[PDB]
């Protein structure tokens, strides 16, 4: 099974070194990919620059480990990087490493949305908590229904870094039956973030 990419936060100007996870194997080739675009060959045979690739990119064979170094990060360099080997007749791509841009801490703005009346008519209630325009991506959301801490009945989704302000947005959605929703009054999501000196709670009382 393939995996979600790991992540590395860095500034323009930073030097970064990515180590390929080792597996008897061949020499590594390194590729770069931006979202919705085809991957591009950067480095082949551990340390040869692919034709046209800038020279800030370099590769090195540490013995048994392979590394890609970007000497000085440019804006266009924020992307996902893959290492690639072969073994017998099979080619393997490693887990992606996403290089993400560092920025000042921004606390999220939190908004809570009750389920619509039209939703209730089909037996389920969705409660949505929005964390908007924050940095860095690490946030904790805790749902409470009449002071009961929920677990296992919510799902989160997070955007990619915004092209303009380098922030993230995140949604947490609580799913309840209509019956369970109408049984309780106070609906709250509590948000912990680096940019909040203490957790922010947003509340509504059902029917106001």
């Amino acid at each position: 099974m393939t995996q979600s990419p790991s992540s590395l936060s860095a500034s323009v100007g930073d030097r970064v070194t990515i180590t390929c996870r080792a597996s008897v194997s061949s020499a590594v080739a390194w590729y770069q990919q931006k979202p919705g675009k085809a991957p591009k060959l950067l480095i082949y045979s551990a340390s040869s620059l692919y034709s046209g690739v800038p020279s800030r990119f370099s590769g090195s064979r540490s013995g048994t480990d392979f590394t890609l170094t970007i000497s000085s990060l440019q804006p266009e360099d924020f992307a996902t990087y893959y290492c690639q080997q072969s073994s017998s007749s099979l080619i393997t791509f490693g887990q992606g490493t996403k290089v993400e841009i560092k920025r000042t801490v921004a606390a999220p703005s939190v908004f809570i949305f009750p389920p619509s009346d039209s939703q209730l008519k089909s037996g389920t209630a969705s409660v949505v908590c929005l964390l908007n325009n924050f940095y860095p991506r690490e946030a904790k959301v805790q749902w409470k229904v009449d002071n009961a801490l929920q677990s296992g009945n919510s799902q989160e989704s997070v955007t990619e870094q915004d092209s303009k302000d380098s922030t993230y947005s995140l949604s947490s959605t609580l799913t309840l039956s209509k019956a369970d929703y109408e049984k309780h009054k106070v609906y709250a999501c509590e948000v912990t973030h680096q940019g909040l000196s203490s957790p922010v709670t947003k509340s509504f009382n059902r029917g106001e």
Binding site: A27, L41, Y44, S45, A46, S47, S48, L49, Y50, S51, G52
Partner: protein, 125 residues
């Protein structure tokens, strides 16, 4: 049938000698030639040898650094590569033709019929 050998990792300024072993008679061969192919680039002619004459031809980029030679007894063609540079990194292939080829098509991919599978060369610090 042609088989290359002698490929390997070298530092800039290093030397390698590639070998190309022919099977069967090579009497009817017009040219024996070394080619190279890097990723994202066309297979390019490096050194060609005209078998009846011994006359050699070389790409501009390798002039005076690379020498093609033959030992007819062993049924072998060699490429001696001195003063290797990063831009020399490629898979190197032996090619031959028993068909006639004009003197200046001597270094073109398609102007040749038989090939080896190639021997990779990496030049890197």
């Amino acid at each position: 049938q042609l088989v290359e050998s002698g490929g390997g990792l070298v530092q800039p300024g290093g030397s390698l000698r590639l070998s190309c072993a022919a099977s069967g008679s090579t009497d009817s061969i017009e040219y024996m030639t070394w080619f190279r192919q890097a990723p994202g680039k066309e297979r390019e002619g490096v050194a060609a040898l005209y078998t009846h004459t011994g006359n050699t031809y070389y790409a501009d980029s390798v002039k005076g650094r690379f020498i093609i030679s033959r030992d007819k007894a062993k049924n072998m063609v060699y490429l001696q590569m001195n003063s290797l540079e990063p831009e020399d990194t490629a898979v190197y292939y032996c090619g031959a033709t028993r068909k006639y080829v004009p003197v200046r098509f001597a270094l073109d991919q398609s102007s040749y019929d038989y090939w080896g599978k190639g021997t990779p060369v990496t030049v890197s610090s």
